[model samples]
Target: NRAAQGDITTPGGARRLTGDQTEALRASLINKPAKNVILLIGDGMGDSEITAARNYAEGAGGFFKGIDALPLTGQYTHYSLDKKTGKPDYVTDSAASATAWTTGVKTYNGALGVDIHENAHQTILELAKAAGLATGNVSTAELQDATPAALVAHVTSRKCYGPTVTSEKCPSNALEKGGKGSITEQLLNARPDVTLGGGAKTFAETATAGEWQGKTLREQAQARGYQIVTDAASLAAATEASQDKPLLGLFADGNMPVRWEGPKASYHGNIDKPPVTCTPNPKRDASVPTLAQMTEKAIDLLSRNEKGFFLQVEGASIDKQDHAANPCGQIGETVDLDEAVQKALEFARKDGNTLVIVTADHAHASQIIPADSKAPGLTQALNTHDGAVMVMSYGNSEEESMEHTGTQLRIAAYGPHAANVVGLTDQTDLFTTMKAALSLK
Candidate 1:
């Protein structure tokens, strides 16, 4: 079954496999029905951007060579049920799109798991837990952010943030712990086994307040049986040894710096890599580990489960930063993401029982090839964004600024039921597919 599914075949001249050889390969591929599955989403990758990234990262002929290096591979279509218009306003937003993958249903643009009628639904993560499978959610964004939050919490609006009237730009002191209903309200509700990333203000008190009256989520998490982790050292120490309970990691007051800049780094300073040196401020050179490191740590801790586990790792800022017109930053984050993929692939290869699937939710900022242009210094064959000279383009790089455009996104799958999702598919189909892979159904 895993014999490359004719991927290496030709009209003729291909050697035929003996019965024994074919049987062995089939036995190995049969593991596609995994007792556990890991899904890696790149958020807003499109076919063109993927191709461009492949070129930018590895160059021609080397296009997707690392991914192609997978034992099984295929292309998958990514379009919403109502994306005929091909506009950001046409397809589902991150919340709805994420719900599609999480609950296997199309929802209003702003909704999380609630459908058009606003009813809560079970997500694959919840279903997996209900079925006795372990689960984890990791992202560079807030744990309550749409994509990560959709895995467990239900919401009518992805942007259910509050305290918008604050003069310091911070939401509120109430948001830090016990506040009016908001996304933080729901996030505090779902205790994922391993929670990494930032957004401390959403769960704690204002930075100015000396009194710790507000309930620290870490305390709540610890009381609920989760071992709290604050810095890279603590997280590494926790993962270095098995824990009797779950793990909770909080990196910042809001969104952690896109690139770790020691501690006092500004979110807008550098979205690609941290500035040359740390500045000592916890917000600047705070020793934010790379996404790759976080992934490694999560997998290590979660793997201790005797029943196996479901871990979600995200490069959230890749899409967010890209839409912010930081291509260099997006690429840097993507490379960091790819490294995580490679790490997962390494584990899957060794533990034939593990199934890993990589994909993106929806594309942002429509991308297109610019008119013909000469390749900087590559061979003469390199010519235009269309084909000759490779280039990356963005939709309305000058418009709305934070808007995510409607574009045909890209999806990459491997391990577990990846073979089922590799070809073209309706975004809604992911529900049935995930349920089937995790044996939730």
Candidate 2:
């Protein structure tokens, strides 16, 4: 547990984190019961992708990112059991992997907050909420997306993003009444203190402009005491103004723009297409908030709770971009995730009693391979074949198919109970570690 126990200087010679620094961090936790827990998930950001982000941000040999300086580091397995056969599936999806960490159960690839047999299991967030702690979920993906949904929604299919989900058949034993409802609806039922992300279209009545003729999920969330903010400017305003209420920010029509994806052009446009055609521009959408901004605001909103909070901030586009075999976009999202990690660490540093854990749901097939002389620097390698293309692309990628690979992921923790996260662990251990950190029964 050398790396997990204390700070280590990087090869770049930067004093990553002083040993006394984390020791002082521990001292801050005195008399505190790990009152706050923040889980930061870098979707599809495996060890290799993290290395690429470090290299891309700081050059070939670079200093550690804030996440790298976390006091405890460990490896975690991401495997789920097939629902029907009860056998382990080595290559897990976001839904199953997230369910493993959130609910402490091995479920099928697309199930959320449910066991392999489709029985609902309470997630850590639900546990915290029941204990009167604040709970929130922030992500760069749709609010109803697998990673976020697993924290709140219990459904059989990851594709059940709300407002218009009717045709898909679901697992019979799923907790939802009809076995048919939007993940967004389930999210509202779970009722977190803060819900910040995209997927506005999932809540809307129609995609076309000027078609707001029906009850929207935005209305539903607000009716339930949320301050609904739909754009970047509004999100900031809501954060400052809604001190007494929960905050809900849905900035884009679908998955928010990946860090480098231009503005709010077309929500379902080329960005969703395969072989990734979206242009890259640092200039962001005025309507969309960055992942870091969302993280800060969520912390602000949730910290208002006297009982402390449990928040999950997800950098979802890392997986989405990797699935498209887009190096630039994936790296951009990874860097953005690191920025969010910085924000969480800053909060945990000041809050003292908060436990911050940074990890990924699973690994993808993307790699930062050396580029050919024709293309200098580093380029991305996509491991995909014909059948792999169908799985990876799903009609989005123009290149050959690349899919998630069965790989161990990195996990790091800071603040209270950080030492408990060391050594090789299973994804389900995340639930147990967090349960203990939060002192949940």
Candidate 3:
């Protein structure tokens, strides 16, 4: 006798209503081209992280005005391919996951903008630019980080940020090897109309070869006519961003600081300590523009172009904070991202021709366990807006850094081609949807 994996015969266990909603749902679909597209990625913000963050910051019933506001939603599988086996690697890293949607191909872990065989592929941003649409890439992480880099750089390894690292980690892509200089250099060549966020330190590294040989990357950006801004005041003062004077804002030396902070999750901490609340990070620099600010400004500047634009904004720290097992940190960054989404949605609603997409690169390790139950791994009890306690568990690993999970992710969208996100799809299909939305050749 075979043991059944599940018992689905129970009442309501195997069925959900489906047939009665065709007309209403059909009317909501916008099967047309969009003038502009705004893609927002919550790096590693899986269902569990989203749920726990919502519970802690907005209460169980309260929803985020940005991340949760998209009308049509679906789940997408984001499996990467193994370079050696050519089989599925169920859990994906950010680099491969971002490459999946951006380039419409799956890559191995630690890879960016390249498929399993290390072949480079054209990304959506590049396609948009070639099609004469303005483009922008914004994030809370270093611009060289995976999610942002996947849009413009192609290399065997995602670590090829500057000349030094490219020489050591990805020599085939080094400037001396007749390959693309590095992620930073390639980004300059890609030349999005607007490039904002962290990674200021890498610009200090001098070029080993090229037209700007021996000059720092910053100088090359300057010599090439980029309107560079280092602080919020400078960024806000930028009145226009175009092919002649693209905007480049580097606000931090590394990944930007998250909005909030709290005690790290610890063994048996869920029950031993009283419920805690997150507080604004004291070290947060006031001079750095918020993600919402960046998004609004990008939309304002890019919208000035007659041909329309494509913008990608990333909530980079949800992944990083989750890795460190800091619930408050991740929650705060989610809030940060939600605000950016609000800005996108607001603009899209007014413009009518813009497509707004909100989703995450991959799943992360965060779960809601019983408040009184202590997990063998790290756990923290948060005092939520609902006036109740929520136990956030991080049992993916016992190491200092938590691990990502293999699972389908939530993908939501609005405006033209938003209907494509209403059913289950593979992450690669996102490229197809966007390509169709923009009418990219």
Candidate 4:
């Protein structure tokens, strides 16, 4: 029942977090406006998931190559409001939680960019764009998934991705209903300079009602002046992304294939079993770009605007993998996210005016347990970087998929206005901080 912990380093290394660190921290605590802001989210990457990934992918004592060592770090509650009562629901789903930070409103568990009352709320990306700054949204999940969808669409249900789905599940948001159309349609209208992810499947569905009534979303995108690319080569060759020709990269039919694969957790899987290692997913397409590559390209294009840019990059599969009780899937996504974070920070270090924030949408179900003990629910043992065996257990739900938890999450930041994230805060406070940093205050 004890908590999992990491290792300590040598004498001079301790000072890395001491005054020497404080001095550097103090230097970055400025409240000036940020010319650019990059928000990186590891969906369902809770404390347990981050720690376990760190323990497995990097040694316990070793720092995260990109995510660790933020000067301003704090815990924040991400409870969603009850749909009927408007009371605290405690636990949150990715949609509700993302809406909080992106819109400064706590919504019900399945809600996207709308409030509990189903009213549309403008997202940070929307505001940044209206304010004349460039905007970008990148994720490892389907582009129409909760986190990314929240930024460009405000449907009552997160499931309202395509016109067919919206008509079936969220009829009020359908284009024929005098609504803002489906998530894909709204995303096209939102028109971020750079938009990249999977979800190509939705683009194949025809729109029910609109100027392009009989056209597929992919066709609609083309008519609307978007420069669409389907592979890594096209994405790399793309030299410009603007309002005249926004970039849309759809790499997979659904969520992108995860980076690594390993054994799945099963009943008593960790008990007296040899630890396993994560290996590259042989099925992952060689043509699909990595999260880091998308991030680098996004930054390159978005930063072209002299007014600055606001970008959100998501490592979305941690939650999906957690639900499937797959240890390696979650770890690999975190590692992939780490690289994207590094890309953002590299730009931030040089630009100085860019603010970099790393956070999670919500807490999830994986926990580190004693290697020798048997754990209930799904359990697995993994070989860690420190030559140790780490056992992970996922017991949050009786159902096949694990559940989200009502716990605090880590939010760490660097660059301008980073100090605002240091104190105890609610998820909604993030909107204000970002707004202020972007000088929309």
Candidate 5:
């Protein structure tokens, strides 16, 4: 009865998994090493957030989403080094947490693909690219945001997304504070085969000489055989055009609008256009391609490489909305992410050699509250760690930015080497696990 209540405890309430039980469970599943790896990160997705998202999904539709159906699940801590003390900082931001998985190193907050000493660290994507496997990154946030930036950019600050940058502009409060170049600059030079998401202005405006000979990042990408797509139609057309060249798609000026928040008709952004108004909706952006569409397109493009691929897909606005204490927006983003997860699982199932992981960088302090015994739907609670708990009104009102909490995050994995993700682990261990599973040197 207790187990049915979601408690894994034995009769005495002591948590333990012994040899025979563990062996039996392990024997039930095959643990073959993986040829391809797909990491799906739902930013700020904690257990409570996932539950809320499921509740929203049930209310909106009739089913639980794809991420909930993964076979192997575990929990992990998301902590960064304090740089000064050289110890766990407990609370972690996106950059540090992502760096942990990207480089298998515990770096200070705001550090991306770089260690505490500001030295460059090779990320899994870098290694995969070096090993001749195609690499790609997709996100709902700006492509150069902390989470995606950590996969390709090596800098000491998360603020350096630009065509123009300086040290003070990319400030890092770490004891060994130093930064160089913008994330956009570094990302262009890194040259992942497929780069999709928003923030077209960052690339269109910034001039760099790295790979494209002093051209704009977008121009450079185009010069280097990258097919650039700016809207839903172009993305579809690009998919049909050719698989030989790489692809870059940027649909919004900033982070793409939340799924339900984009225009009803087709929309796109460029240097000449002003920003579009983003409104929260219960559905999704009809004009832009969904995360699932992006995922499928990326897979199609990257799979052309017979050497296999490493793909990172991120649901970034979950954290962005959670920071603003907007439950509806956050839940919508989670559901959107679930759709992408469904696509990834479908691909992995068909391919058979891919490993799909769903996890979070860290968690927000969001909780579900019962609205009396007879209430039909659910209500959410938000705590800023102050003396007060606020009901989530799901409005556009701006409030104090809530800090990320020091909480263990949930992780689920499927496909080849799925069993390697079992048991409690640290965020940094993910780097090692993926490396070993992919047989990366």
Candidate 6:
């Protein structure tokens, strides 16, 4: 309802889309549905941190933050059947949680599409492909990670990371099926229209030279006609000159740059960590692209698919940082996630057929409201819920050991049928609702 018709065209004095453009835009929205799906995953985002991050970004009095600007929102219970000892109310792990979202079922923490017994179900991604729909997976984690891979792969264990080059596992499994190949193999072979995020190292062939032995997924992605990009310049060029080939972007070798860990915080060669503006060169990764840039490019490429497309965008670092007791790092990453959401929302409004649903794979530590004694900006403050004054951290500090706690998850949406999930429910319900939303498209 808060649609800004001129924002895109008039953005920062950029190319202006005004006047009769409003009519043209409305006309586009009026066109019959062309895209059937868009599932946005905030890998570790939970209700507690979402509220905190939104408040942090929007300033003191504002009731809304980046994600709140969306038209639809929902909630879900996150407890697993294995209660008490597991987590907060027996909450699930990312792998199990991802399986629930992609396969609509519950299993042990490390399992994928298969339940505890290793039974594979119809994953939403595989189901969509079966229905002849275009498919894609996006994330800040490696391409082989559970969340993104769940969109189109099946493996008994989420920890089954393959070697940097070969299809063989590093430890070499002695199972009867042999190495079933890493999930990245399944994704590229499926030939999804767009693949973006980190994990290029795993796709390489020779360990010593890092020369892509043609066995890495990136090489395979290129051979299958994907326009592969490892940095910002190439990504931009690919977007500007794409000609129907699948776009594959691997911004880093492993997990992507955290919010305060990339080049945007400083010049390309400078800065390696958080608290970027505080010094000339913060400790951070210089090779990664900003989350916003990857997001914009993804939309540009996915928008071109004539048969519509399936795009899964992820904020993979949120959970990772939280696990490290560094919620300070996660705040920027979550806000960056918001920027990407803003981009996706802009694209959805311009092209009516697309449906965008944003939610998390699982919850993180306790993440309770801050307490007075907690260190400023420490994630431990998040673990305390005594109605204490929230402590804000400047960077990684001594507050990380506050211990992990289980928290509930959150969800948001925009595009058709979003209203169906407006109220709150258990996190597992996300799978069913997502499947339904995609099917509607």
Q: Highest lDDT among the candidates is held by which one?
A: 3
The C-alpha stretches of model 5 lying farther than 4 A from their native spots are 1-28, 59-63, 170-180, 208-214, 240-244, 261-285, 372-399
Q: Find the candidate with the highest TM-score and give its number.
A: 4
Task: Give all TM-scores, in the order shown.
Answer: 0.74, 0.81, 0.94, 0.96, 0.80, 0.74
lDDT of each: 0.58, 0.73, 0.91, 0.90, 0.74, 0.60
**TM-score attained by model 3:** 0.94
Give per-residue CA lDDT, model 4, range 211-285, as digits (tens): 999999999999999999999999999999999999999999999999999888888889756678999899798
lDDT of 2 by residue, 135-156 (tens): 8899988888899989988878
lDDT of 5: 0.74
Residue-level lDDT tens digits of model 6 in 1-441 = 232333334654332223444553333232233365667677677766576665455432233334666655666765543422433336577777788777777777666677666677777767666666666677888887888877766676666554332233322221223444456655655566677888887676321212333345555566667778888777778743233576788888888767653222111111123322211125345556776677777777666656666677888877776666555566667777888787778887787767777777776652434333333333233221222234333222344332223555567666665655567675557667666665633
Which of the predicted structures, 1 or 6, would earn the higher lDDT when compared with the native? 6
Error of 6 at 111 (Å): 1.1
TM-score of 6: 0.74
Off by over 4 Å in 3: 1-24
Tens-place lDDT digits, model 1, residues 253-275: 66666652122112222232222
Residue 196 shift from truth in candidate 3, angstroms = 0.5
Cα RMSD to the true fold for all candidates: 8.3, 8.0, 5.9, 2.9, 9.2, 9.1
In angstroms, how far off is 20's CA in candidate 5? 15
Candidate 2 regions with alpha-carbon error over 4 angstroms: 1-32, 171-180, 205-214, 239-244, 261-283, 372-401
Worst 10 residues of 2 by lDDT: 385-394
Best-to-worst lDDT order: 3, 4, 5, 2, 6, 1
Residue 213 miss distance in model 5 (angstroms):
7.2
Tens-digit lDDT track of model 3 for 1-441 = 011223336654333232366785676678889999999999999988888887887767567878887878999999998999889999999999999999999889989999888889999999999999999999999999999999999999999999999999989899989998799999999999999999999999999998999999999999999999988999999999988999999999999989999999989889788778899899898898999999999999999989889999999999999999999999999999989999999999899999999999999998899988858888999989879999988898977889999999899998999989878999999998999999998
Supply every candidate's count of residue pairs whose N, Cα or C atoms clash at under 3 angstroms: 23, 6, 0, 0, 4, 21
